[PDB]
Design a protein around this ligand. Structure first.
Ligand SMILES: Nc1ncnc2c1ncn2[C@@H]1O[C@H](COP(=O)(O)OP(=O)(O)OP(O)(O)=S)[C@@H](O)[C@H]1O
Length: 200
DNA sequence: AAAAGGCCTGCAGGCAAGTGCACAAACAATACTTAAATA
């Protein structure tokens, strides 16, 4: 580590060595560096916690190869996990609980997110994620708290996670005639939870 | 085998494309009125 700190340019060094198979769009790789490092927080004590994690989202077309960037990152991040928008249903991605009848206890069956705790959740096709399911993610902005009160079980399960998403303009490639945030169908109550938006 | 939690798809939630068009006013010159020139 001392070797690295001495080797200099470490910031832009990693900013280059990230995604070391693709050249260009340096800025988004910069943001990905900032995400994977994360590592801040404010448990204010005797009061409100503050998520010190990053929620960066994209926007573009297949030509951007953003799914490759996701493979890159959540391969580079320890604990990282990948998925798609429609890959896992709502209850599939958040959590599924079984009231174990043997000891009548709580079993958590690997919600994508809880698996994602202390890791970066890669997400594709976030536009088609069936906004009725956008509630779970929307829940994630309020990090490390996924509360579920159904089927005789009413308890919480925390997931320290940073979410990386990949979206598409609804009109395909892009609508020049229309303003931004039209291309980006996401209701502002989602952007405001995101920190960085990178339309490409 | 059916009744009770949960989640998937048929009905339509909806509205801009868009043409018809039924409102209006001068409209272009109607139809007729009234002063003048000639026997
Ligand atoms: N800067 C780049 N360096 C190397 N390959 C690139 C670069 N930009 C695009 N590509 C290529 O673009 C191809 C398209 O990748 P895809 O995963 O299909 O795109 P994408 O990530 O799905 O974008 P979305 O999610 O459809 S918007 C990849 O296989 C890359 O090889």
């Amino acid at each position: 580590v001392m070797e690295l700190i001495t080797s200099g340019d470490v910031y832009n060094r990693l900013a280059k060595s990230i995604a070391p198979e693709i050249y260009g769009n340096l800025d988004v790789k910069k943001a990905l560096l900032l995400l994977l490092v994360g590592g801040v927080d404010k448990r204010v004590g005797d009061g409100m916690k503050i998520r010190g994690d990053i929620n960066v989202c994209l926007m573009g077309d297949p030509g951007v190869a953003k799914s490759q960037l996701l493979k890159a990152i959540c391969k580079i991040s320890p604990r990282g996990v990948y998925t798609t928008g429609k890959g896992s249903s709502g209850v599939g991605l958040t959590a599924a609980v079984m009231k174990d009848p043997v000891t009548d206890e709580m079993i958590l069956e690997g919600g994508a997110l809880v698996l994602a705790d202390n890791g970066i959740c890669c997400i594709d096709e976030f536009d088609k994620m069936d906004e009725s399911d956008r509630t779970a993610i929307h829940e994630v902005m309020e990090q490390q708290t996924i509360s579920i009160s159904k089927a005789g079980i009413n308890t919480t399960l925390n997931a320290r996670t940073s979410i990386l998403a990949a979206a598409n303009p609804l009109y395909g490639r892009y609508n020049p005639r229309l303003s931004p945030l039209d291309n980006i169908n996401l209701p502002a109550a989602l952007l405001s939870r995101f920190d960085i938006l990178f339309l490409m």
